[PDB]
Amino acid sequence: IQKTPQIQVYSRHPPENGKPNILNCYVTQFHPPHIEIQMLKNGKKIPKVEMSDMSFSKDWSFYILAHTEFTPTETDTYACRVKHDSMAEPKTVYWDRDM
């Protein structure tokens, strides 16, 4: 039985244009543990992306937090793309400043 990843994309701090922050990609509720997470800036992959240690919850599903450093701007688009066995194609989630 496989479980489809749930994803949230958001900043550590309240977004301010031109002020350094941290962008997070929180991936939960998936199984198996193998997963591929990429963070994109204007459609292009971001290279330095730290990954936290992996953990699992009471329902056996795994969860992990991916994060990268960034300086939000008015027009830059950000997203998180997840590749996982439970899904036909990779799931891309866009960052919403108000979410």
Binding site: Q2, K3, P14, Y26, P32, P33, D53, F56, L65, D98
Partner: protein, 279 residues
Amino acid sequence: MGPHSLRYFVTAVSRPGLGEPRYMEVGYVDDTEFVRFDSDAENPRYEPRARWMEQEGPEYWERETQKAKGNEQSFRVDLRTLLGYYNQSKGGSHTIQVISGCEVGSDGRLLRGYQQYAYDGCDYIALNEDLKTWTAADMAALITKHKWEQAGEAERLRAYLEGTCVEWLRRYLKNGNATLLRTDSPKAHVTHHSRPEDKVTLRCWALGFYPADITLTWQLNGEELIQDMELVETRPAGDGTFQKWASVVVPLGKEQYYTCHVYHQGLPEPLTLRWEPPP
């Protein structure tokens, strides 16, 4: 300071063609990670995940490491055995997970013991509440069950639970006590959103809190709007604290008829807020 718990979350995942199985042991005190063994490192050792564990000396770590390496071997055997039970190929990757531990009361006495296994995301076998019988989830699990009943595994577990688990939790709780009682109250605020229509979205935010447990509600003159509210799963800020929000869609001009309530253990009293257009 009432009920407490000490649990180990174990993971063994086969990686045919890429190397040896990945093995991890992660311990929790009151749902707080305190120790971790990860076999995918240098010369794998048990490590402190909370500064208050650093008080335990060299002996402790060496003995916990050795046990972890032995556990790793046992799980490697388990992965092989389950291919046989389920007639599965040697080329596929599979996962075994365990949750093992205990929960005590304020008096230090055992309230409940856990020893539950899972294969590929599904329950496999679990030690019942009585600490004497096992619940098998499928036919493969029945094999282990007969085997474990015969060996008296239940008795070995009850012994670990009532003694070691329980006794070590007490130790852990008196070195981690102050730390585990840590409280970071939320800072809340309301944001206002609109896309040119006759509706607005009010979003209530709770930032910087710890622990994770929290409740956000939107009220329409005393009535909780659970059915029409949108809300995210509490998430980690990445700095140790958590975040969460709850939004509601209200008619343009009626913002002042809605109130957001924030309930968290670190608050003297629940927070009450409304949309507040800036100076």
